[PDB]
Amino acid sequence: STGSATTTPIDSLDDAYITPVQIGTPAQTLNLDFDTGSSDLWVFSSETTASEVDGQTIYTPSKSTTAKLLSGATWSISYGDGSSSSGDVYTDTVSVGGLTVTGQAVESAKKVSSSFTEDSTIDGLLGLAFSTLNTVSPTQQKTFFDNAKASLDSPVFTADLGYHAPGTYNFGFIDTTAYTGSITYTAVSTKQGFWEWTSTGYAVGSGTFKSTSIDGIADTGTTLLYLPATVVSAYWAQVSGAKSSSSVGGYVFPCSATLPSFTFGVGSARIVIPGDYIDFGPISTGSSSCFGGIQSSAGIGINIFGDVALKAAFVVFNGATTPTLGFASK
Numbered sequence: 001s002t003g004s005a006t007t008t009p010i011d012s013l014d015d016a017y018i019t020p021v022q023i024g025t026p027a028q029t030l031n032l033d034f035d036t037g038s039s040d041l042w043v044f045s046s047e048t049t050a051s052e053v054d055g056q057t058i059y060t061p062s063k064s065t066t067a068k069l070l071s072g073a074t075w076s077i078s079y080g081d082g083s084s085s086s087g088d089v090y091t092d093t094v095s096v097g098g099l100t101v102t103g104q105a106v107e108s109a110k111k112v113s114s115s116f117t118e119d120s121t122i123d124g125l126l127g128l129a130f131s132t133l134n135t136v137s138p139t140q141q142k143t144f145f146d147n148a149k150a151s152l153d154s155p156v157f158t159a160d161l162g163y164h165a166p167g168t169y170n171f172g173f174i175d176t177t178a179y180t181g182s183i184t185y186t187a188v189s190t191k192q193g194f195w196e197w198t199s200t201g202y203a204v205g206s207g208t209f210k211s212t213s214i215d216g217i218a219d220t221g222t223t224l225l226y227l228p229a230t231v232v233s234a235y236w237a238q239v240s241g242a243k244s245s246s247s248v249g250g251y252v253f254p255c256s257a258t259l260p261s262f263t264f265g266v267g268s269a270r271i272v273i274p275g276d277y278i279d280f281g282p283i284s285t286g287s288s289s290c291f292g293g294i295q296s297s298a299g300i301g302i303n304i305f306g307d308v309a310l311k312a313a314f315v316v317f318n319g320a321t322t323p324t325l326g327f328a329s330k
């Protein structure tokens with residue numbers, strides 16, 4: 001089998017991408033944030049505290065003839081930004097772009113933190129990291145991809161995120177029309193449950209390439225590109241007036257600037273992020289200070305190839321017996 005679904009930016013900055021997901025019978029379509037950096041499929045639901053729902057579409061398991069309570073199962077998750085959610089668990093039929101998993105664990109939120117409430121466009125998350133990170137207790141659950149993998153034509157999914165435009169998540173096949181040149185595959189460590197790999201270095205703008213190993217994760221659920229402070233400083237040093245602001249929480253730059261590109265290495269290949277992809281716009285409405293799309297990972301403990309990096313590429317998440325990641329230009 002295969003599936004293919006369009007993913008759409010939630011706003012003009014590409015802060016996140018939402019993909020329609022069919023849950024239950026008859027289908028209840030919710031727009032979920034596909035997150036290769038986590039492993040829970042959770043949704044706003046008829047069980048979510050009413051004051052914490054503000055415009056999201058909710059999953060109502062009592063209206064699904066295929067929903068079954070996963071008795072005694074609870075979940076609770078906290079994300080890198082400090083947001084969180086928790087609740088109980090149903091199993092139900094879940095379909096993405098024509099690909100159907102029966103008995104998928106659908107984690108129904110009883111509580112969500114303020115940042116989720118405040119984002120009326122995100123109805124929940126669909127985790128695509130390794131199932132070892134799934135938070136369901138006492139019986140850990142598998143991700144949608146893990147459940148679908150054996151049925152797929154090929155045990156892969158691909159992320160083709162758009163820049164200020166929709167893109168595509170495909171399951172079970174590689175669309176050879178969706179990229180230029182070749183896909184360079186690189187080794188993955190699953191030891192932390194992430195799609196963790198080592199970039200071979202970087203370049204800023206038209207500068208020469210600096211060979212240096214950068215261990216990080218391919219994370220569609222993170223907006224920005226988080227890299228070591230040395231690399232990030234070398235980038236922003238090329239932008240007049242750019243500086244790290246403790247009050248804002250990262251590097252800012254004058255909105256009047258044109259930004260240089262940023263290249264990252266995948267083996268001997270190179271992915272070039274155009275400068276415009278690094279511009280996240282005014283820090284507040286009407287400000288002439290703009291937020292940078294490349295930020296330091298120093299406080300995180302891991303480098304994160306988030307959407308800023310991934311949307312410059314066609315990315316293969318290869319879930320073969322030995323997982324690998326593939327990157328192609330597009």
Ligand SMILES: C#CCN(C)Cc1nc([C@]2(O)CN[C@@H](c3nc(-c4ccc(C(F)(F)F)cc4N)no3)C2)cs1
Pocket residue numbers: 016033035036037038078079080081082083114115116117119122125219220221222299300301302
């Ligand atoms: C600190 C620290 C060390 N490590 C935990 C950092 C890491 N962190 C992660 C993710 O937790 C997993 N992938 C990312 C993700 N973020 C979201 C997300 C989406 C929407 C909203 C909002 F605004 F609507 F509330 C909040 C989110 N947090 N979805 O995925 C972040 C992987 S490594």
